[model samples]
Target: GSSGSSGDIHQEMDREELELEEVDLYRMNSQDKLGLTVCYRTDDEDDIGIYISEIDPNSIAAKDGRIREGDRIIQINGIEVQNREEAVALLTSEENKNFSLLIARPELQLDEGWMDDDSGPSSG
Candidate 1:
């Protein structure tokens, strides 16, 4: 028997949507720091991963000018890492000589209100 209750209709919300784009970052030398602050999060239901939280103004990543503060690092030197330690090791390893970072960034979207036509009221 079906009951007369109103509980299913209100569950339409609770998710956030964003666009993700992939970009590659490079470092010429091991002496230069990546100048990035990456953090680990467990809030996501999926596997744990590192995400960018800050970037230095005059560093490799910033100078390259593609990686953003909120971008999630996918891999370094073609190696996937799940923790910060692994990421650090890849970036600082002298054996690698140079570094290449594959990161996922959220695409910026235009505001809905800004798209309205500029032609307003008719003139006499």
Candidate 2:
């Protein structure tokens, strides 16, 4: 009877990072106003789309909690919106109360909390 010793060799495997790469559809009710500021990217020649520039905290979109800043709006009311003009026209229309917006947001990285560096170790 002998007690045998075996070392467990641990091999590190390269893991692939998974991300949600898909467009999200958000239904918004424009009771009075959507309270969102949209813009088009002119910085990049290839990057041309209606992007969510700002979202008011007291607005419907903000309250809904689906839309966010920098998210590109691809469609409005199930219709593909090509430019800022089309998207803006549809959004500003008073007749279109309840509308659906297809937005594309690149990768949800909520773990990055360093965006707002308000509190830090400082010397007075």
The number of the candidate with the highest lDDT is 1
Give one digit per residue, the lDDT tens place, for model 1 in 10-92: 32111155433334455566677888778787686766767787888888878874676776776675556868888777777
Q: lDDT tens digits, residues 51-70, model 2?
A: 88998877666766467787
Enumerate residue pairs that collide in model 2. Answer: none
lDDT of 1: 0.64
lDDT of 2: 0.61
lDDT of each: 0.64, 0.61
Q: Which regions of candidate 2 fall more than 4 Å away from where they truly are? A: 1-31, 44-47, 107-124
Error of 2 at 21 (Å): 10
**Candidate 1 Cα errors over 4 Å, as ranges:** 1-28, 107-124
Candidate with the greatest TM-score versus the true structure: 1
